[PDB]
C-alpha positions as semicolon CSV with decimal commas, in nm:
position;residue;x (nm);y (nm);z (nm)
1;X;0,000;0,000;0,000
2;X;0,311;0,211;0,033
3;X;0,118;0,312;0,347
4;X;0,392;0,142;0,547
5;X;0,589;0,465;0,502
6;X;0,436;0,596;0,825
7;X;0,731;0,489;1,042
8;X;0,959;0,685;0,807
9;X;0,784;1,015;0,881
10;X;1,015;1,275;1,039
11;X;1,321;1,051;0,992
12;X;1,644;1,247;0,938
13;X;1,899;0,966;0,971
14;X;1,832;0,600;0,882
15;X;2,144;0,379;0,900
16;X;2,098;0,074;0,681
17;X;2,311;-0,207;0,544
18;X;2,403;-0,193;0,176
19;X;2,689;-0,357;-0,011
20;X;2,906;-0,457;0,287
21;X;2,868;-0,109;0,434
22;X;2,627;0,115;0,620
23;X;2,464;0,417;0,458
24;X;2,208;0,679;0,549
25;X;1,887;0,617;0,355
26;X;1,694;0,902;0,514
27;X;1,729;1,102;0,195
28;X;1,941;1,371;0,359
29;X;2,262;1,194;0,265
30;X;2,475;1,200;0,578
31;X;2,837;1,094;0,534
32;X;2,896;0,754;0,694
33;X;3,240;0,605;0,764
34;X;3,254;0,247;0,894
35;X;3,597;0,135;1,009
36;X;3,741;-0,217;0,975
37;X;3,678;-0,314;1,337
38;X;3,300;-0,300;1,293
39;X;3,151;-0,635;1,200
40;X;2,856;-0,602;0,959
41;X;2,611;-0,859;0,822
42;X;2,314;-0,860;0,583
43;X;2,061;-0,879;0,867
44;X;2,144;-0,515;0,953
45;X;2,328;-0,614;1,270
46;X;2,661;-0,444;1,351
47;X;2,899;-0,513;1,636
48;X;3,122;-0,269;1,822
49;X;3,424;-0,423;1,996
50;X;3,714;-0,311;2,218
51;X;3,928;-0,250;1,909
52;X;4,037;0,107;1,837
53;X;3,931;0,067;1,472
54;X;3,584;-0,057;1,575
55;X;3,389;0,263;1,524
56;X;3,147;0,442;1,293
57;X;3,165;0,810;1,218
58;X;2,864;0,993;1,080
59;X;2,900;1,354;0,968
60;X;2,596;1,582;0,939
61;X;2,525;1,922;0,777
62;X;2,759;2,201;0,883
63;X;2,612;2,515;1,038
64;X;2,788;2,830;0,918
65;X;2,619;3,145;1,052
66;X;2,394;3,005;1,324
67;X;2,393;2,701;1,549
68;X;2,192;2,394;1,450
69;X;1,974;2,274;1,736
70;X;1,689;2,034;1,805
71;X;1,357;2,120;1,965
72;X;1,195;1,778;1,961
73;X;1,390;1,473;1,847
74;X;1,397;1,095;1,889
75;X;1,649;0,812;1,864
76;X;1,554;0,455;1,775
77;X;1,753;0,130;1,768
78;X;1,766;-0,232;1,876
79;X;2,058;-0,346;2,098
80;X;2,199;-0,664;2,253
81;X;2,419;-0,623;2,560
82;X;2,617;-0,929;2,668
83;X;2,584;-1,072;3,016
84;X;2,842;-0,971;3,277
85;X;3,136;-1,200;3,349
86;X;3,089;-1,370;3,687
87;X;3,457;-1,304;3,758
88;X;3,441;-0,941;3,644
89;X;3,145;-0,811;3,842
90;X;3,314;-0,506;3,991
91;X;3,431;-0,368;3,656
92;X;3,084;-0,433;3,507
93;X;2,895;-0,241;3,776
94;X;3,139;0,050;3,808
95;X;3,295;0,132;3,471
96;X;3,067;0,342;3,251
97;X;3,148;0,350;2,881
98;X;3,007;0,557;2,597
99;X;2,870;0,366;2,300
100;X;2,742;0,657;2,087
101;X;2,838;1,024;2,121
102;X;2,708;1,327;1,929
103;X;2,846;1,663;2,041
104;X;2,978;1,988;1,897
105;X;3,122;2,265;2,114
106;X;3,060;2,039;2,414
107;X;2,686;2,025;2,366
108;X;2,475;1,739;2,233
109;X;2,374;1,391;2,344
110;X;2,520;1,050;2,413
111;X;2,424;0,696;2,502
112;X;2,636;0,513;2,756
113;X;2,622;0,188;2,948
114;X;2,727;0,111;3,304
115;X;2,675;-0,257;3,366
116;X;2,302;-0,329;3,344
117;X;2,205;0,035;3,289
118;X;2,163;0,208;2,953
119;X;2,191;0,586;2,982
120;X;2,071;0,875;2,765
121;X;2,243;1,208;2,838
122;X;2,163;1,558;2,713
123;X;2,411;1,847;2,742
124;X;2,304;2,200;2,656
125;X;2,499;2,503;2,534
126;X;2,592;2,581;2,894
127;X;2,727;2,239;2,987
128;X;2,414;2,172;3,191
129;X;2,344;1,798;3,210
130;X;2,034;1,579;3,237
131;X;2,005;1,198;3,216
132;X;1,727;0,938;3,186
133;X;1,806;0,566;3,209
134;X;1,677;0,212;3,180
135;X;1,817;-0,052;3,416
136;X;1,728;-0,421;3,393
137;X;1,756;-0,653;3,693
138;X;2,062;-0,876;3,724
139;X;1,927;-1,086;4,012
140;X;1,646;-1,242;3,816
141;X;1,601;-1,610;3,734
142;X;1,539;-1,556;3,362
143;X;1,599;-1,209;3,213
144;X;1,406;-1,081;2,913
145;X;1,696;-0,841;2,847
146;X;2,046;-0,972;2,924
147;X;2,215;-1,076;2,599
148;X;1,883;-1,067;2,409
149;X;1,795;-0,823;2,130
150;X;1,554;-0,560;2,260
151;X;1,405;-0,240;2,113
152;X;1,501;0,103;2,244
153;X;1,347;0,443;2,176
154;X;1,435;0,773;2,340
155;X;1,208;1,072;2,265
156;X;1,270;1,435;2,354
157;X;1,058;1,751;2,369
158;X;1,123;2,073;2,558
159;X;1,004;1,927;2,890
160;X;1,067;1,551;2,905
161;X;1,315;1,288;2,796
162;X;1,151;0,944;2,778
163;X;1,299;0,597;2,730
164;X;1,073;0,334;2,575
165;X;1,168;-0,034;2,580
166;X;0,997;-0,273;2,338
167;X;0,726;-0,019;2,264
168;X;0,649;0,051;2,629
169;X;0,738;0,358;2,839
170;X;0,994;0,272;3,110
171;X;1,166;0,594;3,214
172;X;1,105;0,969;3,211
173;X;1,314;1,267;3,321
174;X;1,203;1,630;3,355
175;X;1,434;1,833;3,133
176;X;1,248;2,167;3,140
177;X;1,551;2,325;3,308
178;X;1,789;2,223;3,026
179;X;1,855;2,470;2,743
180;X;1,952;2,439;2,376
181;X;2,134;2,128;2,251
182;X;2,368;2,137;1,948
183;X;2,244;1,869;1,710
184;X;2,480;1,867;1,412
185;X;2,792;1,719;1,569
186;X;2,960;1,408;1,430
187;X;2,794;1,094;1,560
188;X;3,060;0,854;1,686
189;X;2,971;0,487;1,735
190;X;3,254;0,338;1,944
191;X;3,299;0,180;2,286
192;X;3,472;0,440;2,499
193;X;3,579;0,388;2,858
194;X;3,762;0,150;3,090
195;X;3,624;-0,173;2,945
196;X;3,725;-0,538;2,946
197;X;3,903;-0,629;2,621
198;X;3,620;-0,878;2,560
199;X;3,336;-0,624;2,582
200;X;3,113;-0,584;2,276
201;X;2,778;-0,440;2,171
202;X;2,542;-0,537;1,889
203;X;2,311;-0,273;1,742
204;X;2,059;-0,263;1,458
205;X;1,830;-0,018;1,273
206;X;1,979;0,301;1,424
207;X;1,767;0,603;1,336
208;X;1,702;0,959;1,442
209;X;1,387;1,167;1,404
210;X;1,346;1,542;1,439
211;X;1,017;1,497;1,621
212;X;0,894;1,347;1,950
213;X;0,771;1,004;1,840
214;X;0,434;0,895;1,984
215;X;0,405;0,566;2,176
216;X;0,158;0,460;1,909
217;X;0,423;0,519;1,641
218;X;0,693;0,346;1,847
219;X;0,471;0,038;1,894
220;X;0,413;0,014;1,520
221;X;0,786;0,041;1,448
222;X;0,848;-0,223;1,715
223;X;0,602;-0,456;1,542
224;X;0,736;-0,388;1,194
225;X;1,103;-0,436;1,280
226;X;1,015;-0,752;1,475
227;X;0,844;-0,907;1,172
228;X;1,019;-1,188;0,984
229;X;0,936;-1,512;0,802
230;X;1,189;-1,700;1,011
231;X;1,145;-1,785;1,377
232;X;1,398;-1,663;1,629
233;X;1,597;-1,817;1,909
234;X;1,609;-1,717;2,277
235;X;1,856;-1,436;2,201
236;X;1,639;-1,293;1,925
237;X;1,850;-1,417;1,633
238;X;1,711;-1,633;1,355
239;X;1,630;-1,994;1,450
240;X;1,828;-2,253;1,258
241;X;1,839;-2,621;1,163
242;X;2,124;-2,851;1,261
243;X;2,220;-2,625;1,553
244;X;2,242;-2,744;1,913
245;X;1,982;-2,586;2,139
246;X;1,878;-2,609;2,503
247;X;1,501;-2,579;2,541
248;X;1,327;-2,310;2,745
249;X;0,956;-2,293;2,836
250;X;0,793;-1,950;2,864
251;X;0,514;-2,087;3,084
252;X;0,755;-2,261;3,321
253;X;1,069;-2,046;3,303
254;X;1,257;-2,227;3,579
255;X;1,207;-2,573;3,426
256;X;1,412;-2,785;3,185
257;X;1,383;-3,121;3,009
258;X;1,578;-3,429;3,120
259;X;1,534;-3,784;2,991
260;X;1,388;-3,962;3,295
261;X;1,607;-4,251;3,411
262;X;1,487;-4,598;3,311
263;X;1,206;-4,442;3,104
264;X;1,133;-4,328;2,744
265;X;0,999;-3,995;2,867
266;X;1,132;-3,654;2,952
267;X;1,092;-3,540;3,311
268;X;1,084;-3,171;3,405
269;X;1,342;-3,050;3,656
270;X;1,417;-2,713;3,818
271;X;1,707;-2,510;3,681
272;X;2,026;-2,498;3,885
273;X;2,115;-2,143;3,996
274;X;2,420;-1,915;4,019
275;X;2,643;-2,099;4,267
276;X;2,894;-1,836;4,377
277;X;2,776;-1,572;4,622
278;X;2,801;-1,227;4,464
279;X;2,558;-0,982;4,628
280;X;2,502;-0,821;4,288
281;X;2,377;-1,107;4,072
282;X;2,148;-1,409;4,048
283;X;2,024;-1,616;3,751
284;X;1,920;-1,968;3,654
285;X;2,160;-2,166;3,433
286;X;2,056;-2,186;3,067
287;X;2,286;-2,451;2,923
288;X;2,117;-2,745;3,093
289;X;1,879;-3,024;3,011
290;X;1,888;-3,226;2,691
291;X;2,077;-3,080;2,397
292;X;1,815;-3,068;2,122
293;X;1,871;-3,011;1,753
294;X;1,616;-2,931;1,486
295;X;1,624;-3,136;1,167
296;X;1,446;-3,053;0,845
297;X;1,164;-3,295;0,758
298;X;1,023;-3,229;0,411
299;X;1,288;-3,266;0,139
300;X;1,600;-3,339;0,345
301;X;1,888;-3,263;0,106
302;X;2,242;-3,251;0,250
303;X;2,114;-3,061;0,555
304;X;2,425;-2,889;0,694
305;X;2,236;-2,598;0,852
306;X;1,979;-2,334;0,750
307;X;1,701;-2,104;0,872
308;X;1,377;-2,229;1,031
309;X;1,063;-2,056;0,902
310;X;0,703;-2,047;1,022
311;X;0,505;-2,354;0,907
312;X;0,819;-2,560;0,839
313;X;0,794;-2,936;0,893
314;X;1,062;-3,065;1,128
315;X;1,195;-3,349;1,341
316;X;1,277;-3,254;1,700
317;X;1,578;-3,460;1,806
318;X;1,823;-3,450;2,098
319;X;2,152;-3,618;2,179
320;X;2,151;-3,912;2,414
321;X;2,524;-3,940;2,479
322;X;2,648;-3,894;2,121
323;X;2,346;-4,073;1,970
324;X;2,072;-3,867;1,806
325;X;1,731;-3,963;1,941
326;X;1,395;-3,818;1,844
327;X;1,078;-3,680;2,002
328;X;0,751;-3,859;1,923
329;X;0,389;-3,877;2,032
330;X;0,192;-4,201;2,031
331;X;-0,072;-4,198;1,759
332;X;-0,311;-4,307;2,033
333;X;-0,381;-4,166;2,381
334;X;-0,707;-4,103;2,565
335;X;-0,610;-3,861;2,843
336;X;-0,639;-3,486;2,778
337;X;-0,261;-3,501;2,780
338;X;0,003;-3,773;2,767
339;X;0,381;-3,803;2,790
340;X;0,589;-3,749;2,478
341;X;0,787;-4,057;2,372
342;X;1,167;-4,025;2,353
343;X;1,352;-4,291;2,152
344;X;1,602;-4,376;1,872
345;X;1,535;-4,263;1,514
346;X;1,291;-4,518;1,373
347;X;1,006;-4,550;1,123
348;X;0,769;-4,723;1,366
349;X;0,405;-4,697;1,263
350;X;0,306;-4,678;1,629
351;X;0,376;-4,307;1,664
352;X;0,392;-3,966;1,498
353;X;0,732;-3,807;1,435
354;X;0,655;-3,504;1,220
355;X;0,621;-3,167;1,390
356;X;0,516;-2,838;1,236
357;X;0,671;-2,536;1,405
358;X;0,422;-2,251;1,440
359;X;0,373;-1,903;1,576
360;X;0,034;-1,844;1,733
361;X;0,128;-1,514;1,895
362;X;0,010;-1,208;1,701
363;X;0,248;-0,984;1,902
364;X;0,634;-0,982;1,891
365;X;0,791;-1,284;2,058
366;X;1,083;-1,523;2,044
367;X;0,859;-1,815;2,141
368;X;0,716;-2,065;1,896
369;X;0,480;-2,363;1,923
370;X;0,530;-2,724;1,826
371;X;0,233;-2,907;1,675
372;X;0,186;-3,274;1,586
373;X;-0,060;-3,331;1,300
374;X;-0,182;-3,655;1,142
375;X;0,026;-3,554;0,840
376;X;0,142;-3,254;0,634
377;X;-0,164;-3,239;0,408
378;X;-0,411;-3,334;0,682
379;X;-0,581;-3,075;0,900
380;X;-0,637;-3,317;1,188
381;X;-0,418;-3,164;1,459
382;X;-0,303;-3,413;1,722
383;X;-0,177;-3,172;1,985
384;X;0,085;-2,921;2,098
385;X;0,412;-2,992;2,278
386;X;0,424;-2,853;2,631
387;X;0,461;-2,933;3,000
388;X;0,201;-3,087;3,233
389;X;0,206;-3,192;3,598
390;X;0,083;-3,553;3,610
391;X;-0,037;-3,749;3,915
392;X;0,176;-4,054;3,998
393;X;-0,054;-4,252;4,229
394;X;0,185;-4,527;4,333
395;X;0,067;-4,801;4,562
396;X;0,210;-4,581;4,834
397;X;0,362;-4,295;4,636
398;X;0,094;-4,024;4,603
399;X;0,287;-3,755;4,417
400;X;0,242;-3,506;4,133
401;X;0,519;-3,473;3,872
402;X;0,596;-3,253;3,569
403;X;0,652;-3,421;3,232
404;X;0,744;-3,312;2,875
405;X;0,399;-3,362;2,721
406;X;0,157;-3,333;2,431
407;X;-0,187;-3,183;2,490
408;X;-0,522;-3,163;2,310
409;X;-0,613;-2,880;2,547
410;X;-0,353;-2,638;2,406
411;X;-0,511;-2,675;2,060
412;X;-0,809;-2,470;2,177
413;X;-0,623;-2,248;2,428
414;X;-0,403;-2,102;2,152
415;X;-0,725;-1,982;1,987
416;X;-0,829;-1,761;2,279
417;X;-0,760;-1,389;2,232
418;X;-0,537;-1,225;2,323
419;X;-0,284;-1,505;2,264
420;X;-0,186;-1,665;2,595
421;X;0,182;-1,590;2,666
422;X;0,172;-1,792;2,989
423;X;0,093;-2,120;2,810
424;X;0,331;-2,407;2,872
425;X;0,324;-2,471;2,499
426;X;0,550;-2,174;2,419
427;X;0,912;-2,269;2,367
428;X;1,238;-2,094;2,300
429;X;1,564;-2,246;2,182
430;X;1,890;-2,146;2,351
431;X;2,222;-2,199;2,168
432;X;2,560;-2,146;2,337
433;X;2,648;-1,779;2,293
434;X;2,963;-1,583;2,369
435;X;2,738;-1,321;2,525
436;X;2,625;-1,560;2,798
437;X;2,873;-1,745;3,021
438;X;2,771;-1,941;3,332
């Protein structure tokens, strides 16, 4: 409809990937210099490292007779900040480093990071300062932010500086007392401060607007830049085939899958937690439970790797001590839910092995759903993969226990609006990542 141009309104700088480089497609033609230390890929993601040559310099229109200033302006971008090093806590919490700086005659703005806090700073013509920040908890079991791509938007008008995270307002600072801010300085993208040589930042879709973006407009941009045909992993990157993944359940965040001893089923256990005793941090381990791997079903030709897309037909396997086993459901079960069947790769006609990976959520998410159908062409849906607490009435036992299950119930629950985010049928895949050490 070319009606999707709405999120381009008032844009004055739009950094985009093009021919192994970054260029401003705003139409105002800013000069962009990307140095050799900046890693760039087609997916619009760029990485800033500790290297001196890891920087980006953007030059804007020069102001000859008068000073160029902003009244209302906004800054948009996605970012992924790696988790702190357990052995480098002090440096993480105390050393602030600039990631992006835009100033001329000591006036302008900048974005800096101090540990788990992202900071927006304004400096007027007098040197007067004002800051608004977003800090995410580092003592939480499962963080929605640490080492995961998330959307940032900072808007400014003459009275308030607001920080929006993932389309929602998180912080606000009264800036009425701050004066004019020089806006045409060079914009330097580069890590600057006393940082660990291993520190890095990933950023994507950096843009500036010469207006105060509305929440409504920010939400739409959030939705549009979150949209993709491929599914994503726990970190927000594209989901792939033939890649080792630990499985996470949105509905039961502190649980993981473990092949139950002496059984062909997966039991659900509680995640181990940070063992040391730092008073600053806490988290549940993520690299635990069975190591799963997604294999392409339909047309399996020399599968070495690749991207998983919505509606793809797959095989959900996992390694049982070097051997690659598979996840199945019995073609027959009468309970509302039953235990999934874990076993070697076979063609048995006693159970279903084909899964279709879906996305029932209409809003941005990194979760997906796993559905077993009679077959690819059939519309008879068997059930969705999830977690359910069964009742093990032993002759003396009398105990309830969580199992990796399939459920007929979910099939109707995923239909309810708004889409249920708390469902135990929402999964996320976690691959080892340099940004997360435990």
